[PDB]
Amino acid sequence: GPDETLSLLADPYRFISRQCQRLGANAFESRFLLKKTNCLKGAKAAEIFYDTTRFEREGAMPVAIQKTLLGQGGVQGLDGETHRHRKQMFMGLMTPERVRALAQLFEAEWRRAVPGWTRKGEIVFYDELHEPLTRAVCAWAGVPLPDDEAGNRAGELRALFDAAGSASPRHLWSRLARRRVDAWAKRIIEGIRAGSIGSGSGTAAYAIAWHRDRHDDLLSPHVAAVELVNVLRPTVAIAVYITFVAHALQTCSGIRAALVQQPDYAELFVQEVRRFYPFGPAVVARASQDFEWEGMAFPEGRQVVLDLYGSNHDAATWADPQEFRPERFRAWDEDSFNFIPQGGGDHYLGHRCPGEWIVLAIMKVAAHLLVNAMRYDVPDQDLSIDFARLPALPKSGFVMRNVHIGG
Numbered sequence: 156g157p158d159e160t161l162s163l164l165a166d167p168y169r170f171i172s173r174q175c176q177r178l179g180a181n182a183f184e185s186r187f188l189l190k191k192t193n194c195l196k197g198a199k200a201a202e203i204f205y206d207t208t209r210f211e212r213e214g215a216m217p218v219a220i221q222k223t224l225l226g227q228g229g230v231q232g233l234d235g236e237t238h239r240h241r242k243q244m245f246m247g248l249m250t251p252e253r254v255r256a257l258a259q260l261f262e263a264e265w266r267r268a269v270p271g272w273t274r275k276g277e278i279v280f281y282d283e284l285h286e287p288l289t290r291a292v293c294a295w296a297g298v299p300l301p302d303d304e305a306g307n308r309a310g311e312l313r314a315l316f317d318a319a320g321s322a323s324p325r326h327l328w329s330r331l332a333r334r335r336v337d338a339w340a341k342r343i344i345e346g347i348r349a350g351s352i353g354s355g356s357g358t359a360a361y362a363i364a365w366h367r368d369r370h371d372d373l374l375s376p377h378v379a380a381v382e383l384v385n386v387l388r389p390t391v392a393i394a395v396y397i398t399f400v401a402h403a404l405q406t407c408s409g410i411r412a413a414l415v416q417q418p419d420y421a422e423l424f425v426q427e428v429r430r431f432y433p434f435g436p437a438v439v440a441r442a443s444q445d446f447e448w449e450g451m452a453f454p455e456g457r458q459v460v461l462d463l464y465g466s467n468h469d470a471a472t473w474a475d476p477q478e479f480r481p482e483r484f485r486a487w488d489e490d491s492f493n494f495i496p497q498g499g500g501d502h503y504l505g506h507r508c509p510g511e512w513i514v515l516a517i518m519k520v521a522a523h524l525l526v527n528a529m530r531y532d533v534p535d536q537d538l539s540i541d542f543a544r545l546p547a548l549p550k551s552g553f554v555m556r557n558v559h560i561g562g
């Protein structure tokens with residue numbers, strides 16, 4: 156079989172579902188970086204992908220992703236009881252009270268940033284979100300962040316996710332940003348352990364710095380650093396979803412009115428933004444033993460990818476997935492496998508994103524501010540979603556003019 160890495164990279168979000176569509180199947184065999192790969196889509200496929208008796212993550216992450224997006228030694232690369240113990244550390248951070256606290260900090264940082272946006276006249280909304288997110292998440296996590304360093308640190312965190320998948324010198328910047336962010340986070344962990352940094356007992360950096368593994372040993376400082384960055388970086392990546400919130404408000408008739416007057420609408424709206432827009436790329440695992448499924452062979456060791464975007468657009472589940480319709484979530488049964496913008500299955504027993512509560516809370520803050528507080532003009536621009544970009548974004552980055560918050 157031919158290597159299809161280039162075709163995938165040219166259409167990273169839609170390649171799998173388009174090929175599935177052509178074959179009339181929810182799975183097909185392909186090859187990426189010269190490695191045979193079964194590509195899966197849909198709720199039934201997601202349920203098998205999350206069966207940890209059939210799939211493992213250890214050794215499955217391509218080195219280039221380790222050197223940019225994720226780091227090395229983090230929870231994403233663990234299996235079994237080692238994984239579940241590490242995953243508990245992240246899950247303990249996500250209490251309703253703590254999630255609310257981060258959302259409040261973010262609202263405050265967004266409001267603090269507005270005067271600067273007004274003074275600029277014209278802004279690229281996406282570009283402006285990374286710093287307020289960085290400031291909020293650092294404060295929340297007990298990470299000191301001097302005012303004069305916040306801009307630079309926000310740029311480094313952005314590079315980890317925004318420049319990692321760029322086929323350009325930007326990827327090299329992502330690699331340098333990873334080296335810098337790991338070293339910075341390690342100094343934070345070291346300071347906490349030495350008692351020179353006074354992070355609170357409820358904060359992420361404290362929890363991670365003092366986490367004991369299954370042998371009652373502290374994480375090595377590098378691993379602790381990577382895990383701390385696994386809180387900081389993806390919180391900054393919410394800039395992408397906030398940009399999509401602004402995009403939906405701009406391009407979908409009736410949405411703004413519904414959000415303004417119907418209090419229960421915001422929850423439905425944020426979920427539909429997660430369903431509708433591409434963001435999370437396909438997740439990778441490896442078959443842990445020989446099995447067969449739906450007439451497809453999964454030999455032990457076979458690389459397997461789960462298409463999140465395609466699953467979120469599966470007509471069997473949604474009927475009319477092509478339409479942006481928040482109302483559809485009134486009929487959702489909260490199934491753990493059929494709606495998977497940040498993974499499927501169970502949070503404790505699998506690799507599902509622990510950041511979902513934070514993402515939902517911050518997206519609701521964004522939707523609230525964009526319809527009830529923040530006034531802005533939207534000049535003529537290319538708002539179409541760039542499906543060739545990782546992460547995907549409106550081509551313009553969502554340009555605003557005349558931004559103020561006295562409305």
Ligand code: HEM
Binds near residue numbers: 511514
């Ligand atoms: C910004 C939008 C986000 C998207 C699109 C996203 C998506 C995902 C996806 C697809 C996975 C992998 C699921 C799997 O491997 O089966 C994941 C895992 C993870 N996410 Fe997120 N996430 C986001 C935000 C967050 C936030 C805000 C946090 C932390 C505060 C976070 C922390 C993590 C961690 C630590 C993992 C690894 C969990 C594990 O391996 O057990 N994510 N995320």
Ligand SMILES: CCCCCCCCCCCCCCCC(=O)O
Binds near residue numbers: 219319320322392434
């Ligand atoms: C060309 C080399 C490929 C590089 C790998 C591309 C990975 C970038 C993916 C961007 C999606 C962003 C989703 C957030 C992920 C996270 O924060 O953990």
